[model samples]
Target chain A: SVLTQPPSVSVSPGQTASITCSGDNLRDGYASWYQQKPGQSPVLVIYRDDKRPSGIPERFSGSSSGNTAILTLSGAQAMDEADYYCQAWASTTVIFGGGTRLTVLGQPKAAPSVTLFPPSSEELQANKATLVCLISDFYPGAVTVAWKADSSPVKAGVETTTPSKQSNNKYAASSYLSLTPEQWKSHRSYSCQVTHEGSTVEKTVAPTE
Target chain B: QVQLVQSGAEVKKPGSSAKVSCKASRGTLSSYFISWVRQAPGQGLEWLGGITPLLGTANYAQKFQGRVTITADKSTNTAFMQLSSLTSDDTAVYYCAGTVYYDILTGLYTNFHYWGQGTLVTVSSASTKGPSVFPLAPSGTAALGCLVKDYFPEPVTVSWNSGALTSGVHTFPAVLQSSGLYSLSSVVTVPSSSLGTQTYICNVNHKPSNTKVDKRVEPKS
Candidate 1:
C-alpha cells in the first residue's frame, strides 16, 4: 500500500527538470531518493534505485521500467530550486513518493547547482562536501526528509526525481550530501527534515565559522 | 548451508514465561525456515516469526500477532520461540533466522540469512540467570531512553541509530505506555546522527512469513 506523486514542477534558473516515481510492485527492490529544500532538510540523492552516491552530479539520474521511476535535472541553476522525494524500503516501511517543486528561472549561479562526484579538492576543503535539500509545493504525496550532523547522521549522498509536466499523478525530488569539514565541524549539528501527511518540517545547520 | 549457531539468555520477573533457542548447523533441518528477530538497547531489525519443517508453518510480524510462538526440531536441528505475558520492558535481543528467498507473486520472504548470536531477555521481578551481553552506549543526544513490556497492548516502536541501518536517522513516536505488567517507558528527541555502530529498532507489524498454518497446534503436535 505505497503510492507517490501529487503534481508539482517549475524550472527556469537554467532549464532541465523532470521527476517521476511510480510504484505498485517496485520491480526488484531498493529505491530511495529524496531532496527537499527551502530552509533545507531531506537529502540522499539515490541508492540502489540507480546507485549514484559519492559526489553525485551526473545531473542526477535514476531510471526504472515496469512500475515507472525517474528523476533527472541537468544544467538547471538558481540554487536549482527545491522539493522532491522518492523512497523505498518497503514491507518494513519507508515508502514515499509524491512531491516536486524546483523553481529557479533566473540569476544565482556561480557554480554549485549540484556537484560532489566523490571528493578530491583537498577532498572539498578537507574531506568532502556536497549538500542539497529542497522541497516546495506538495499535495497528496506522503512526505519525510532528514539528515543531521553534529546532532548526528550526516553521510548520505545521492538522490534524484522529476516528472510532472502538468499533473496526472505528479512528482518531484532531489537529495545529496557528503560531509568532511571535520565531519561538519565534528557533528555540530546539520539537518534537513520533513514529514508530510502528519506535518513536520525541520531545517537546522551550524558550524560556519 | 543452514546455520543459526547459538542462543540463550533470559532473566524473568515482571510476569513470567520466556523461551529462546536457535541451533542449526549445516543442511537438512527440514530444508529451510526458522525465523525470529527483535533488537533493542540500540535498535533496528524486527521480524519475530517463522518456523517450517516443510509443512509446520507459522508466521507473525503483524506486530507479533497474538504475542509470539514458533517451534521446530527436525530431530534436534533446534528452533523454538515463545514469549507470553512478560514484563519489565520485556528486555531485548532475540534472534534465530534462516530463509533467504521465497516469492511466488508477493508471497514474500527475503533473506534473513543465518543469525542467532543474540540472547538477552531481562524482565525483572527478581529472576536472573546466565547469558549476558549488553554494551550499547553512544547516545550523543537525540534523546532516547526506553523501558517496555507488552502482552499485545498494541503500540510499541522506537528507533534511533547514530550509524548504519544502511544510513541511519529514524524516529517514530505516537506514544504509548502500559506499565504494571504491560510495561512502558519512553524518551525520544531527534535531529540526526549515525556514527559508530549506530542502531535503534523497535517495531510491531502483524503477519507476513508465508502465512498459512493450523498444522494441528504444532510442536510435534
Candidate 2:
C-alpha cells in the first residue's frame, strides 16, 4: 500500500521543516516525488525520489523504507507553500497519491550556507568607492545574482561559459560582479545572498575610511 | 448510457492462448472508441492498445508493440484484442475503455476514461466448448445463467429447447468482449410443472480459421 502525510507543516520565515513517508512492504524500488504549487500543475522534484535535480538546493533529501518513504526540507521558506507527492514504478504501473502541504511564516531570513566579503583583515579607505560580496558552493545555477549597497540588489555583471569535450556530459556555470574601489566606501555595507529552494545565504561587507 | 456487462472468468492451459470480452449497450457502436489495458496482480496499469472502428487507426503502447492487437466491428459496436503466448505472468485482469469527451473542443483523445469492471482470465486447461457455468442472479423465475471459454471467440450462438423435463429456457445474444473475444448466455422461466430435457446451442459460427470446433450446451434438464 502507498501512504503519505504532511497535510501541512508550518515554519518560521527562514527556518526549515521536513515531511517523511514510510512504506512497510515495498523495498528496493525507486521513489519519485512531485510538487504541486497553488495554481500550477505538479512539477517533477526528486525523480528516483532522492537525488536532487540540477539547479536544486542541497537542503532537500528523500529516503524510503521496505514500503515507506520520507522527504525532508532543511530550511523551510514561506514561498514553499505547495503539495508534495511520491510515486514509483510499482510493478508495471506507476503508483502515486496526494502529497503534503507546507506553510511558511514571517519575513525570510538569511540562510546559514551563505558568506560575505569586506574582510576584517584589510581596512578599506572611505575614498575607496567599490565593494563586492561572494557566495559559493551553489550547484548548476543561482536563483538571485550578487548585489551591492546595504539592501539594494545587483544584477550579474557577466558569466563564463565553456563546453567540455570529455566527461559524463556534465557542465559548469560561473559569473562575476564589477565595481570601482571608491564606490565601495560610500555604500560601506553591501551583501550578496544566493537564494534557491526556499533557502538563502548572505555575506555582508563594510569599508573603513 | 452505454454499458458493457461482461461475462465471468476463464481457465486455459499453457502452450495455448485465451480471450475475453465486454459488450456495450444504449449507444451506437461506431460513435465511440474501445481500448484494452492489462494489470497483473499487485502491479501498475499497462496500456495494451485501442481501436477506433470509425477511423481504422490502431494505437498501442510501445511496451506492447508486438504483443497485442485490437479490432472492432462497426455493425455491432463491439471491440476485441488478442494476446498470444500464454504464461502464468500473463494471468491478470483485463479491461475495456470508452472514449469520453472531456471538453467538446478538446475532443475524446484527452478523456479516454476506463471501464469500472474487469474480466479475469487464467491460463490453464483449454476447452472446445463452455468450460464452466455461472449464474448472475438467484435461481428462480426469469433467472439468467452464462457460460464462457478462454480465447476462442466468434461463431458462439445460444438457443432455447424446452420440454417436459426441467424448466423453460430463452437463449440470449452471443456478445463480443472487450479483449475482442466472444461470449454467450441463456435466460429461462420456471413453470409449475417440471419441463424436462431442454438444451441450448452456443454454436461457434463455423469460420475458415477453425473449421472443426463447435459447442452445444444442456440448459433446461
Candidate 3:
C-alpha cells in the first residue's frame, strides 16, 4: 500500500543501475533497502535513508526525493544478480515494495544437459508409470519444460519444477510425467523438452527392446 | 468496496493451534480471490494457500498441505486460516490478502489491492528466555555479524569479544518480531588478510534472565 517498484531491471557487469520505490508515503522519509538472494532471507543493505548497515559495501547508496526512494548500486558484479526490496515506515505500518529483480547481463548462454528415464518395473506393476526428466548444467536459471507423447504435446499429468542453482552456480531442474501402465505400454515414445535462452532441446525415452 | 480487516494478535502455547480471521468489508466476496500468507519472525514470506469463494474451491502450497486449512464464510464475508499443532516454527504473522484483477486474461493485470493487518501469533512456552547467539552468513569473502535471537523481556546487551568498540561497528536496534520475541544484530568488517588466523567472539548478556551467551567464530581457514 505504500511503495511501488519495477518488476525487473538489467545492466551489464561493471555498469551502474538504480531501482526506485515510489509512493506518496515516502515523500519525506527515505526507504531502506534489502538484498535477498535465492533461498536466503533478506539482508539489510541500506537503512535510515542513506546509512549502510554495519558492514554493507559503499557501492550501495540510498536516497529519496519527493515521493520516491532510490537504491543505486555502482560497479555491479555477477554476484549482484538477486532480488532487492525497499521499505518505508509509514504513518501506518511499514510498507514494502513488491521487489525488483536485478539481472546482470552479458554472460554467455548455456543450454541444459537433458536426460530422460522410463518408468521402473515396480512402478508399472502398481498400474502407474512415472517418467523422469532431469535437466542440469545451465546458466542464468531460466528455462521451461514440456512433455510430449508420440511427438504430440501433452499437458495433463506433467509437472516440472523451476530451476534451482547448483553448487557450481549452474541451474538444474526436474520434471515428471505420470502415465497409466496401459498407456505407457501402448505409446511408442515420450519425450521431455526443455527450452532455455531461445533454444529448445528434446530428450526422448522409449520402452526397452 | 473491499477492505480487509484482520483479527488481533494471540499468544498460544507451544503445542497449540491458532485461528486467524479476515473480514472483508463488502459482499460479492465470491467474485475475488483471497489468499493466506505467512511471515515468520525475521524470515522470508511464505504463501500458504487460498480459497475462491466463487468456485468454492481451496488450494494450497504443497508444503502447507494438511497442516493448515483456509476457508471462507460467505454469510459473514470472512476468510479464515487455522494452523494446527503449532510450534516456534509456525510463529508468524498470518496475512489475509486479495487480488483485484483488471484483466481476466491469465489474471495478468492484478495487484494485491486488499490486505489485512496481519494476525500475529506467538507460541512461546516461557515468557522469559535468554537470547541465542548465532553467526550471520558471511557476505563477500571476509565479514561477520552476531545475531541474538528469540529472547523475551527485551533490553539485552551485545558486545564483541566482551567490550564495546566503535568505528566500523554497528549494533542495530532491538527488533520486536510479530512472534513477541526480540532480536538484535551487530556487524563488523574483518579484513581479508587476518581471516586465516583471527578468532572473534560474540557475547550477548541477558539481564532479565541472568544469562549470557558466547558464540565464537573460528578463523576462516
**Best by lDDT, which number?**
3
For candidate 1, state the interface root-mean-square deviation in angstroms to 1 decimal: 20.4
Candidate 2 chain A: minimum summed lDDT over ten consecutive residues — where?
A163-172
Q: Mind listing the fnat for each candidate?
A: 0.00, 0.00, 0.00
**Total clashes in model 1, counting residue pairs 3 or more apart in sequence or in different chains:** 60
Q: Lowest summed-lDDT stretch of 10 residues in model 1 chain A?
A: A109-118
DockQ score for model 3, please? 0.02
TM-score for all models, in order of appearance: 0.21, 0.32, 0.43
Between candidates 2 and 3, the TM-score winner: 3
Model 3, position B50, has a per-residue lDDT of 74
Q: Which of candidates 1 and 2 reaches a greater DockQ?
A: 1
Model 2 residue A119 lDDT score: 21
Regions more than 4 Å wrong, model 3: A4-7, A22-30, A38-40, A54-58, A64-68, A90-92, A137-173, A182-191, A195-209, B1-221
Which order, best to worst by DockQ?
3, 1, 2
* All candidates: DockQ: 0.01, 0.01, 0.02
Worst 10 residues of 2 chain B by lDDT: B101-110
Cα-based lDDT at residue B97, candidate 3:
66
Best by TM-score: 3
Residue runs of model 2 more than 4 Å from their true location after superposition: A1-209, B101-109, B114-116, B125-221
In terms of docking quality, model 3 is incorrect
Model 2 TM-score is 0.32
Candidate 2 Cα deviation (angstroms), residue B25: 0.7
